[PDB]
């Protein structure tokens, strides 16, 4: 049984090698079956009818897995008709028997495994929302399926809560010479354009549209299949960078498609024998028909719809829809070819490009801001699997995924990131209209002049890797010279904090217990974490107590607070702002700070910039303006405001 017809119009990789194994494999469904094959040539209705009828003389309980190579549309329909008035289930594989036809007669049995237009639209909406573009137009032309295309697009848009902006629906159908086309082309002003036409119609529309200027450096066209052919036969007037989706042929070879078809037929036969214990034949006659009415004996219709193979499942449904098609997304190459980015395998796209390459259309403020999390200034939060997004206001800063062992070379995984500086950055973006490429830096810490090389933040600023490095930077003499800093916006300094919860007297470093590293009696503390402002300032100003407490630095700040609570020494020379926030927002406000914020040197914080960057004056203007308009007070009252600040 089961016969396969071919003939190698282009791919002559066949002969008897194609008729190899098949149902034997490891399948436990043996019976009087074979793997009979046949070769042919270019198809004409008389020749095709005669050949299939002749094969019906022996294919008594068999089927056909025919495939073609041309682009004649009627081939699928003729196959459907033959399947209808012969009762022999068949499938389609390549080219001609690959474009899915809309409706089939119920008294028919064949299922080509292409992909529905609605599936294409769903995948396209998924990729568009993944890049967060939302606003788009729907220019099209008159062609069959355009109406259902439009209606399905609208209904899918409306039935979700992500908020697509629907506008500029254009359905020009009056040739391409009158003023209606001109005004319709002029009216659209968005950056995302979705087209739907038929081959030469699309190329003519694009040739008209390029003369208007909608084909600049910030526009997209996501044409659905249509102008894709079956090769790299793109028209010469197709400029570049055309986003498209199509059926896969490079990750799926015909040598495996035939195997899958054979397995599906065998599994269906096994299911029929397990449910009916007998499979009849229909080898009466091809010609001389209209001699018998319907006979529902062993129809394959209920025996295929939920059939898997070797674990892999590709069960169909109703029409030729295979539920799980292997759609692939491609882009136009610079050398007029098709790329391969992402593959629709699961409901997730699994794309390859983190950002868009900005393809040259025909033959500017987005920058890379670099910062890391620290203090109540930048806060790291994990992404939310439920209703996948970064909550409501957190921005997607993409950390360099860190691992252990030799596999530490991770990718750039997304994260939800906020803090006390992200709001300032976003309001500056509002007033300046500059985008971002924020990503976490993991190479060190804030940075210091160690071995004449800066690691983390400022190092990028001195190594052409971060034009801006906003965050929790501290203004210093050596850092400002090498990194273009800004006017301070908050007051910061050095403060001494004591856990004396178990009057200020001496405030500062003018005492016999702090200035003198020796004498006194009890073991005191000068805990200062490395790579920071406190240690550098201490060693620059008074390099005497640092040597006494060189082997006393805590690992971080949480363990520092733990050691402060766990009484071994009650002293910490830290930042005035961080210590004040911690004391204000402490558990019961137990530990306190010596003095009324007598900072050793109130230098404050600064905003990083590149050397000679063209934005410093505007940055200062915006900073002073926002200092004027009583809003950073609101920011401080929202984030750094304590609970015991008013309490005495």
């Amino acid at each position: 049984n089961i016969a396969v017809m071919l003939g190698h119009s282009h791919d002559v990789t066949e002969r008897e090698l194609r008729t190899l194994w098949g149902p034997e494999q490891a399948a436990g469904l043996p019976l009087d079956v074979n793997v009979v094959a046949l070769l042919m040539n270019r198809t004409d209705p008389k020749s095709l009818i005669t050949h299939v009828c002749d094969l019906m003389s022996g294919a008594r309980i068999h089927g056909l897995v025919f495939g073609d190579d041309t682009d004649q549309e009627a081939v699928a329909q003729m196959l459907d008709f033959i399947s209808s008035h012969t009762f022999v289930p068949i499938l389609g594989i390549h080219g001609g028997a690959s474009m899915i036809m809309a409706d089939k007669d119920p008294t028919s049995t064949f299922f080509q495994f292409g992909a529905s237009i609605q599936q294409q639209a769903t995948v396209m909406l998924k990729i568009m929302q993944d890049y967060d573009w939302h606003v788009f137009s729907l220019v099209t032309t008159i062609f069959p399926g355009y109406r259902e295309f439009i209606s399905f697009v609208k209904t899918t848009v409306d039935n979700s809560f992500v908020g697509w902006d629907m506008q500029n629906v254009i359905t020009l159908d009056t040739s391409f010479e009158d003023a209606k086309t001109q005004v319709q082309l002029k009216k659209i002003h968005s950056s995302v354009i979705l087209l739907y036409c038929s081959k030469d119609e699309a190329v003519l529309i694009l040739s008209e549209a390029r003369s208007l200027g909608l084909t600049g450096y910030d526009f997209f066209w996501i044409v659905p299949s249509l102008v894709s052919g079956n090769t790299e036969l793109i028209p010469k007037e197709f400029p570049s960078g055309l986003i498209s989706v199509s059926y896969d042929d490079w990750d799926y070879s015909l040598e495996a498609r035939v195997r899958d078809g054979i397995g599906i037929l065998t599994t269906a036969a096994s299911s029929m024998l397990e449910k009916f214990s007998y499979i009849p034949e229909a080898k009466a006659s091809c010609y001389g028909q209209m001699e018998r009415p319907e006979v529902p004996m062993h129809t394959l219709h209920p025996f295929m719809v939920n059939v898997t193979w070797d674990g892999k499942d590709l069960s169909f449904t109703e029409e030729g829809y295979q539920v799980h098609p292997r759609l692939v997304v491609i882009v136009l190459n610079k050398d007029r070819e098709w790329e391969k980015v992402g593959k629709w395998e699961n409901h997730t796209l699994s794309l390859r490009h983190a950002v868009w390459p900005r393809y040259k259309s025909f033959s500017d403020n987005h920058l890379s801001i670099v910062t890391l999390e620290e203090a109540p200034f930048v806060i790291v939060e994990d992404i939310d699997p439920l209703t996948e997004t970064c909550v409501r206001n957190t921005v997607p800063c993409r950390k360099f995924v860190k691992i252990n062992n030799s596999t530490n070379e991770g990718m750039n995984v997304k994260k939800c990131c906020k803090g006390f500086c992200i709001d300032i950055l976003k309001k500056l973006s509002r007033t300046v209209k500059f985008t971002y490429d924020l990503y976490l830096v993991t190479n060190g810490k804030h940075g210091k002049k160690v071995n004449n090389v800066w690691n983390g933040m400022i190092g990028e600023v001195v190594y052409q890797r971060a034009v801006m490095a906003v965050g929790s930077l501290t203004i210093n003499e050596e850092r400002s010279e090498v990194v273009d800093f800004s006017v301070p916006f908050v007051e910061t300094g050095i403060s001494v904090m004591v856990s004396r919860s178990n009057v200020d007297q001496v405030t500062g470093l003018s005492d016999k217990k702090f200035q003198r590293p020796h004498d006194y009696s009890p073991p005191f503390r000068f805990g200062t974490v490395p790579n920071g402002s406190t240690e550098r300032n201490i060693r620059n100003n008074y390099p005497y107590m640092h040597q006494y407490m060189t082997k006393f630095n805590q690992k971080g700040v949480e363990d520092a607070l733990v050691s402060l609570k766990t009484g071994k020494l009650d002293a910490f020379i830290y930042d005035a702002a961080v210590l004040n926030y911690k004391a204000g927002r402490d558990e019961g406000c137990k530990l306190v700070t010596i003095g009324s914020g007598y900072i050793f040197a109130t230098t404050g914080y600064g905003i990083a910039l590149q050397k000679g960057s063209p934005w410093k004056r505007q940055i200062d203007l915006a900073l002073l303006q926002f200092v004027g308009d009583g809003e950073m007070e609101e920011l401080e009252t929202l984030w750094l405001t304590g609970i015991c600040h008013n309490e005495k």
Binding site: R585, T641, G642, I643
Partner: protein, 36 residues
């Protein structure tokens, strides 16, 4: 001796706490404003 929160924006109430936890009851007619 009574220091109950005066207004939702009270820093004791606005900032998260652990003594008593706010109750919305069935998550309806209030959850809409809370998500708002």
């Amino acid at each position: 001796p009574e220091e109950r929160i005066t207004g939702i924006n009270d820093p004791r109430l606005r900032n998260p706490s652990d003594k008593f936890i706010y109750a919305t009851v069935k998550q309806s007619s209030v959850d809409i404003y809370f998500r708002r």
